[PDB]
Design a protein around this ligand. Sequence first.
Ligand SMILES: [Cl-]
Ligand code: NA
Length: 259
Amino acid sequence: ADVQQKLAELERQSGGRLGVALINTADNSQILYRADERFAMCXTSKVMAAAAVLKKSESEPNLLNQRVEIKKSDLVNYNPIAEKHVNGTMSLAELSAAALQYSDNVAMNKLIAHVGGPASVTAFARQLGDETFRLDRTQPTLNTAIPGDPRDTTSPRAMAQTLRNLTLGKALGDSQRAQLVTWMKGNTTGAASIQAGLPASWVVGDKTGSGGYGTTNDIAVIWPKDRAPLILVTYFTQPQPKAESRRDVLASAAKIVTD
Ligand SMILES: [Cl-]
Ligand code: NA
């Protein structure tokens, strides 16, 4: 009740729309706030794309070593890693790491294309038992985050459950699960988001997202000191098309639900 009041107060002060789902594996409990509403995933969808490639690799041993050409025509709006590799190749492992750890747009698009496109990523989610996730578009258009638009959305509840399956459950084989967790623990983009609301000693693997309407997102697997792990999804979006980022809102939500 108090956690619910605190999240409602945070949402009101922020001016936007906040979605939270925490799974605490200590006691199999959840803390939910707008957890069945849809939110634009933005960058957070790259976990599903990378997981689809990892799943494909379970029946294609050297898949992660497969080379992918990077060309000027592949560049999109945010290419921090791929821009360094234009006119050469990157492996699927390198693209997965760039997508997950730097939010590289080109890398996401190569993962999407490899597995057959947005509808194939969505079909993979369905195979896992996630009937909420939808990836409709590639980068950069999947980030538009227009209010009322269901494209490229999921709910906090569904994303938390799916992230739990991918990182702590059995969606992926042991090698592939460990690889996903290692990639997420090496993320470089999340220090101001969920991590900023947790004690410094806790270990986090996370994936952020951002987009139009000031959309600011983070999804995380969290190992608190000497405790069972948590899964936390914090999704946030705002009324104005050109609203600025609000990573502090995600940090505040994380602090509220883990205090
Ligand atoms: Cl505006
Ligand atoms: Na989206």
